[PDB]
Amino acid sequence: GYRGLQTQAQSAVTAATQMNNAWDSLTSELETLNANLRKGIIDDSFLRQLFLTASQTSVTKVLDGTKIIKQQMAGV
Amino acid sequence: QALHIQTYCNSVRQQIPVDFGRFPNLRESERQINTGLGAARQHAEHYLKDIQPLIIRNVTNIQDYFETQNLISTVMPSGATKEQWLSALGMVSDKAKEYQEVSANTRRTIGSLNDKLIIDSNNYQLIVVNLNNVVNGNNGVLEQLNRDIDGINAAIDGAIAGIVVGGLLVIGGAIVTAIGAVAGLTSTPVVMGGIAMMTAGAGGVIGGAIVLDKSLSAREKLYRDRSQLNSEVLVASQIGSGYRGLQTQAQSAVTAATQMNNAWDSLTSELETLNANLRKGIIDDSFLRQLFLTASQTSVTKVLDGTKIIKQQ
Amino acid sequence: NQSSQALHIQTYCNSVRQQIPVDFGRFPNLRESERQINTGLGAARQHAEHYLKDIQPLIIRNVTNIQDYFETQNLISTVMPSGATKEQWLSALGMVSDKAKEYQEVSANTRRTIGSLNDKLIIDSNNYQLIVVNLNNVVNGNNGVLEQLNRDIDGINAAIDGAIAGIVVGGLLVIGGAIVTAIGAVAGLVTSTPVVMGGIAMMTAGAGGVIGGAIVLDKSLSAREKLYRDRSQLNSEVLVASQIGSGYRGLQTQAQSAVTAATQMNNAWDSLTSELETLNANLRKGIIDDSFLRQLFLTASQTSVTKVLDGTKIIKQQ
Amino acid sequence: LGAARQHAEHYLKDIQPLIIRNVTNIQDYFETQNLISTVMPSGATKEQWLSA
Amino acid sequence: VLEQLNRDIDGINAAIDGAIAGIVVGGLLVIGGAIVTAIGAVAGLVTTSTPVVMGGIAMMTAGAGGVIGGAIVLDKSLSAREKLYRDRSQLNSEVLVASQIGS
Amino acid sequence: VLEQLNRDIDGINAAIDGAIAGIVVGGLLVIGGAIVTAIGAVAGLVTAGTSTPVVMGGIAMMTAGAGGVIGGAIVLDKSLSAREKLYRDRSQLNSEVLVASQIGS
């Protein structure tokens, strides 16, 4: 049982490390957009349609995944 | 989740106290079981009389609060001062903080319930193992008894044989003695042999009866012990099945409780996000204020969902 | 009730992660089995982490980009659309053609990823099966030994009873000898020396039998004990093997299903890649076409576009 | 066993893929075949139909 | 190889039974020897019963020797039979696997 | 066929045990013979005359023990070698039947 608990923690460590890399990537991606913006490389016209298209897809798909995980813990 | 625990609670209440007083080896088992059952009962009464009701209250208050919390005026509603909007937001922020604290309180209650159930299930399992061991030992004894009972019937038949052989010897001796007597006219040796056969027949019948009465009387003691052990094992297997069923009920209730803990934890986090979204909007002047206020409006939907979710749990 | 291909693999992945390493340290015959199992389990874990942390996410990304692309380019304008130069239409088509080419290359890339995943899963399932067979062999050998033990244990109880018999017979002989000796002695105090001798002899023999039997019994149970210990040890080892074996068997099934799920995903991407190539071919032949033959290839490409949009929805479901 | 594995990988990675391509090509072909009269209006030439 | 294994496996359990036999026969021989030795000894105190005592002591000695020798063989044998059986099963599995890949 | 084989295999183990018995009985006879011979020899080194018959009986017991051990070994090697042929046929028939039951299904 203790051995199994040790494995559960080892896996949770990997899961957490993964989450750390994900946030780190998002932080870096934001910095790149900021740098792209500041230099005049993009426009607040085009970057709006970019985030709006992601919201139409990816962002909505993540928001759903969040509500789903919230239920999976509750059993609701 | 709640109904599943509510059912398991009333069910445990119906768990009757046992006296294995007839079984000397189950003395510790009975007391241990009785104590554990008593403790579980205490856990249930608390859960029923306080916990579930208190949880319902906090959720209801939260439900009413979010109900009032209309669509968020990220900019400021029509014909109001900036101070008026700030005051209303500050009031809402304060109320949310209180609600957040209440949510944390409910979680703690759930945590205690979880621990109580966990302890109950564990104690149940311990009783089951203790019982399983008793019947798994008692069934070694049972085999040695059946083997001894088989060995005892042999002596029982050996006595039955001696008793019959004696009866025949006497019967034959009488016929011989009578013949030998009529042939005396001498025929004294025939009469002697007939009397001897009669005498020996009586001796064998007497000796066998003594052995038989004693042999069945050893056999009786062994059979009594076998039956007593069989009954004790059955009783253990009876209470054992019941405890096993109770252990499952608790294991399920643990999952139900853990689920409720995660639900409250989510609501608490969602409130903290709305609070953070709110706070940063009060110390923001123009566009960044409307940004945090819109995010808080999304917070508000996330909390309203968490409410409906907890209500279902 | 049925799961999507990805969820089936996602479940199998997290499940393999939970696979604990075992030590058959007590079992001398399972030494190689344990190490082999441990190694294979370790490798499978590596396959899962990759699948979970990289593969499934990368696949999702490529599909999403494809979904967004086809969304923008929903239907091919076979005819010269309203108020445009022929060059303007040609440029737009050429741009679409170039984008499709890039998307085709991306599709081939995803397929390669799937291929690697397939191989990784295949290797995992194979190693699992190998452990199962290795285990099955151990319990199927160990159960020959178990029978010889039960047969020997049966043969041992006979000597155990034979000693018990000698001990009792000795006790009776001594008891009877004492009664006879006492009788013979009282008859010698009237004028019966042979009776006393026979009584003393019966007593002597009774003691000898009780002593000899005790020596044999203590030794016989002590041979019986060694045999029983081995029997129990083998029984436990076999049970342990049958325990881990059931688990490995379940893991093997999980991998076999994941293999089917992966193969399905490979076929899906292959279809999307082919559908893109057809649209590209339909496009290319329309740029180097006169009036009517151009609209013909452009309409076929519009049908291509629907076939790709379907392939997208299909992959999304996988 | 190694050689047999090679045979399978080829069958799976290349045969199965080529078979899949065939269906797509067929799909594209029949797509155009319908598109023939779909484009060719009322009063197209016999030569125009023959060329297509 | 499989035939040499089955022949060796037969020779392994054979010695195992041969020890089991000697241990039982040994226990009886000793038991009988003790009864005989005791009889022979009481007849030597009672006038020319030395040969009976010798035969009884010999039976006892042989009985003990068989019980001891069997125990030594058994303790040594038990580890060896398991190894042979394991190899037999492994070979059986390997042959099946080979027959499987062919099919 | 399979039943006649199991019945014959049962009949074969009896001779196999009968050889195992002769081998052990021989080992004991030799062991006892050695103890007797040694006793008879030490009694001949005080009363040369009259402890020669004991030594003879001890040597005879040893000789007979060896004879039984040798005879049994010959029988055993042959008996298992008849048993082995029967077992091989049984396994072959079992496999054939299984294969038939496989294709049959």
Numbering used by the authors:
A (entry chain EEE): 272 to 347
B (entry chain FFF): 27 to 211, 216 to 343
C (entry chain DDD): 22, 24 to 213, 217 to 343
D (entry chain CCC): 63 to 114
E (entry chain CCC): 167 to 213, 216 to 271
F (entry chain JJJ): 167 to 271
The authors write:
Tripartite α-PFTs are members of the ClyA α-PFT family. Proteins in this family undergo a large scale conformational change from a compact soluble structure, where the hydrophobic residues are hidden often within a β-tongue motif, to an extended pore structure with the hydrophobic residues exposed in two extended α-helices which insert into the cell membrane. Here we show that S. marcescens has a tripartite haemolytic α-PFT (SmhABC), and propose a mechanism of pore assembly. We present the structures of the soluble A component (SmhA), as well as the soluble and pore conformations of the B component (SmhB).
Like the AhlB pore, the SmhB pore contained ten monomers of SmhB in two conformations (type 1 and type 2) which assemble into a ring with pseudo tenfold symmetry. Although the resolution of this structure was low, the electron density was clear and continuous for the protein chain, enabling a model to be built with residues truncated at Cβ. In addition, clear positive difference density could be observed in omit maps calculated with sections of the model deleted (residues 157–251 in chain A and B), indicating that the structure solution was correct. As seen in AhlB, the head domain of SmhB undergoes a large scale conformational change transforming from the soluble to pore forms, with the β-tongue substructure refolding to form extended hydrophobic helices to α3 and α4. The transformation from a soluble β-tongue containing structure to an extended helical pore structure seen in SmhB and modelled in SmhA, occurs in a similar way for A. hydrophila AhlB7. In order for this conformational change to occur, the C-terminal loop and helix α7 must move to free the β-tongue to form the two extended trans-membrane helices in the pore conformation (α3-α4), with the N-terminal helix (α1) also moving from parallel to α7 to an end to end packing, resulting in a narrower more compact tail. As the overall structures of the soluble and pore forms of SmhB are almost identical to those of AhlB (RMSD Cα 0.64 Å and 0.46 Å, respectively),, not surprising given the high level of sequence identity (62%), we investigated if these structural similarities also conveyed functional similarities. Haemolytic assays, replacing the SmhB component of the SmhABC pore with AhlB in a 1:1:1 ratio showed that this chimeric pore had the same lytic activity as the SmhABC pore.
